[PDB]
Design a protein around this ligand. Structure first.
Ligand SMILES: [Ca+2]
Ligand SMILES: [Ca+2]
Ligand SMILES: [Ca+2]
Lengths: 304, 304, 304
């Protein structure tokens, strides 16, 4: 149950984040510009927290006591100290493009991206609206509203208990894997924003956890978070095998899928299901002949 | 540390500039003619560079040494390669009006606009006048003359160090955000022309960086660069709500603000602030009951 | 003769694995995140096992009778019950980092890493490929094929038998030292994958058990399994001793050697054998005098 936020706290966050920026400006890093890109994400977060503070000028005790914002600010300071402690321990490994400590910086940078996207979804124009956040899928929005009313945020354990009474979770290992998918901000809470993303991606509600198992646990087509330029470079090694395809999450477009595939004429196209569940777009695209070989493999999962 | 300029250097620039014209002429793009319009900006820039060249016909070693001109030419090459490479990578997504890569072309056209406007400012009718450039606001021109004397262009880190000793900049994050506003040409210097636009927009000088914060960082009414038609179109949705308003910059009129608003009879009028700063104009427009609802929202910032 | 795998032996493994994860999540533990890390390996073994189960949904009678799959699952269940009973008996002592229980936890953590690498080499993307596995060194490949044909896995005693027929094992003590080197998964069987590993490390095949004696049996530079960081932290006491080196196996790179060594400039650097055999590169290196004081000792073994 985290501490009341005040200006000292937000001022100290700005000093931590400044440090992270100075660390990531080292030209030995050769840090790429692609999403997620921590040298944009930090100052965009700073801009949107100034925008929040400005809206609450009269009313800092109402802001500082908001539970979502207290959880968020505690997590922003934690994740900032983690990135600083990662430079300090990783040292010369930080300059090795694909060492462990560098792949960890990419993970953090992702979490900063998710954090900022959640903050803007809860405080659009710097005003709190978590209690009126619009859940996109109607069955998911009934489930939240009944179990949690207008809550913006819930501890993982209550979320998992509430979810289990409607979509049974079959082991503790399944449950930790589910946590790590849904808890994008890695703070052991489930926001209503994070719940909207996950139920959008793994719709329809009625076989939620079965869609999640077969699209994102077991499917050779699944890439988790990638950039469009990283999809093209992966499928390019299969430019010669029409019907090769993968599907990815996008850190600039939370809650949507993008399908990359190799056409008959040796190009690579991308499609965004806007229309159907991914599950159905994969079934249709296999029977239309476009989505045959997931990560270029011969055998395609049966989803029907 | 920029390299010395010759006609060779100009010709290869014109050559790259020429590639981008051909790339932007592609019928498939369906390039809209609204400012900023790269198919006018590139040839107009090509035209001013020739005036300049002609003016410098056999005093050409004194042109090529000018520190402003070396920065310029290096920046125009950088920005033109980046445009060319944008089309390389973007491929089919160039013809998607709202792709990321098409939104990057809009940002680059803006930069080409700002580059042309500065070039003409510093070299009016083709002759170097940067050391006598007239700065618009008196308190700003005295700051520039004290810290920098007659210089035309200064490295961001010296500008930032001098401005901080008069208008203190609270964090690295806040310095980043500032640079993104002042550095129009995205070259990591600050021209006396760039400085004059910033100080005009964010007068008065005595409250500079707090004006910038309350007008352009945190204000829901701020639109950054739009056209007059984009303004109309956006306020069109707020026809039924008199006293709605936004405020915009103009790529064709650097250093000047333009307010759109909804009248009591349901018309959209645009105005262009008279002889008060924006800040006072917003204050007065509220008082008088015109500017009530910034981008149609119920709560207007208190600028008082 | 381990028993058939059914989905009720598999639900039983998931429940033991859960328990291990809850034990090892304990805050007093203060479990470091470095490899092998049991809080990643169990969740990854479960992902990979669920992928296999999904590929065999129509065909469980065919999965559940597979000998390698029956040996693996029997051994996963034993190694997990052993981990739990390590906690049940150790009690408070688990929270002392250098206690014997906590070194046993690290040993079993290694084993879980080896087991997951083996299961992925045998079931790439969840499908059985044991019978067409690719052994790297062709002399090794012929031996396995003459002895065992297309088998994936053989009892230690059969293996020791066929090996000795080609490469006499000189004693029951030596044999048992060989077992600890080869039998990574400590189940008393030798897979095609474990044999591929051993034969890469201790190549060439023509003098195999002599290579092993000289690298692993009689060499004070042999460090066994170790991290990059644990290499730096042991040579750190020879930074004043140009050319102290040790060499080490890596749980994340099975079948590859790594070498650390102190430079003269006094730096600790670490390579990855240069494609020749360790044997060769330890000479060569010696001959270039990089590699001199094996663990700091003034006498170097003589491989030659
Ligand atoms: Ca979370
Ligand atoms: Ca500039
Ligand atoms: Ca074994």
């Amino acid at each position: 149950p985290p501490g009341t936020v005040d200006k000292k706290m937000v001022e100290k966050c700005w000093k931590l984040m400044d440090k992270v920026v100075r660390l990531c400006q080292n030209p030995k890093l050769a840090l790429k510009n692609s999403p997620p890109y921590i040298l944009d994400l930090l100052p965009d977060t700073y801009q949107h927290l100034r925008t929040i503070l400005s809206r609450y000028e009269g009313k800092m005790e109402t802001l500082g006591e908001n539970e979502y914002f207290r959880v968020f600010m505690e997590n922003l300071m934690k994740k900032t100290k983690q990135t600083i402690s990662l430079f300090k321990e990783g040292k010369e490994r930080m300059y090795e493009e694909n060492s462990q400590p560098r792949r960890n910086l990419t993970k953090l940078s992702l979490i900063f991206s998710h954090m900022l996207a959640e903050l803007k979804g809860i405080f659009p124009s710097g005003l709190f609206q978590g209690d009126t956040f619009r859940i996109t899928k109607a069955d998911a929005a009934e489930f939240w509203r009944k179990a949690f009313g207008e809550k913006t945020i819930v501890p993982w354990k209550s979320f998992r208990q509430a979810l289990h009474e409607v979509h049974p979770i079959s082991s503790g290992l399944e449950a930790m894997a589910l946590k790590s998918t849904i808890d994008l901000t890695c703070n052991d809470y489930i926001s209503v924003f994070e719940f909207d993303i996950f139920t959008r991606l793994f719709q329809p509600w009625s076989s939620l956890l079965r869609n999640w198992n077969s699209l994102a646990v077991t499917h050779p087509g699944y890439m988790a978070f990638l950039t469009y330029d990283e999809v093209k470079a992966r499928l390019q090694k299969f430019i010669h095998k029409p019907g090769s395809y993968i599907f990815r999450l996008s850190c600039t477009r939370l809650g949507q899928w993008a399908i990359g595939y190799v056409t008959a004429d040796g190009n690579i196209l991308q499609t965004i299901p806007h229309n159907k569940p991914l599950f159905q777009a994969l079934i249709d695209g296999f029977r239309e002949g476009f989505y045959l070989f997931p990560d270029g493999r011969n055998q395609n999962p049966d989803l029907t």
